[PDB]
Amino acid sequence: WHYVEPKFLNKAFEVALKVQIIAGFDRGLVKWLRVHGRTLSTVQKKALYFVNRRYMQTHWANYMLWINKKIDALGRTPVVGDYTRLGAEIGRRIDMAYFYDFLKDKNMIPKYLPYMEEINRMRPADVPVKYM
Incomplete structure (x- = not known):
């Protein structure tokens, strides 16, 4: 009987949170981009x-504390x-949008890099989260 490490939150519960x-x-x-979409490059929008x-x-x-x-x-x-x-509440x-305005105005929208594309391509259910 090989030991199994329990998840610190049920997978289905975690997925529900991340998806929502x-x-x-x-x-x-998307609502914010109604205005700013035309003022940003594709790579800037993907970075957001x-x-x-x-x-x-x-x-x-x-x-998780909350x-x-x-x-x-x-x-x-x-x-x-x-x-x-x-999850829907969060x-x-x-x-x-406050944060998008900040990043845009202060020119701090991240350079869009391969790891970010990796994270963006993932299903929300699969985005890695760390507990410990």
Whole structure:
């Protein structure tokens, strides 16, 4: 009986979060690009899609603190729908347009590099997140 390392969050729960967060961030980017799309190059716009994913990745630890505080407080068994909802909440409440405006105005939109293209091509479900 070979040991299995447990995941620190159920895969389906993680995927629900990442799919809803990235979907929400991307939707706000699309709305923002209604104005700024024509003022940015394709590689700048793709870099902003990558910024969404990297933002999720670096805020993941804080999100897990927030998520687990609410899940811990549930007087019942958690289910995937709880995480879909929490993920959708993060996805809509973060007004990423503030950040897009900052990066554009200060000329800090990342150079679009191969690793970013790698991250952008991934399914949101597969975007790597770190717990420990």
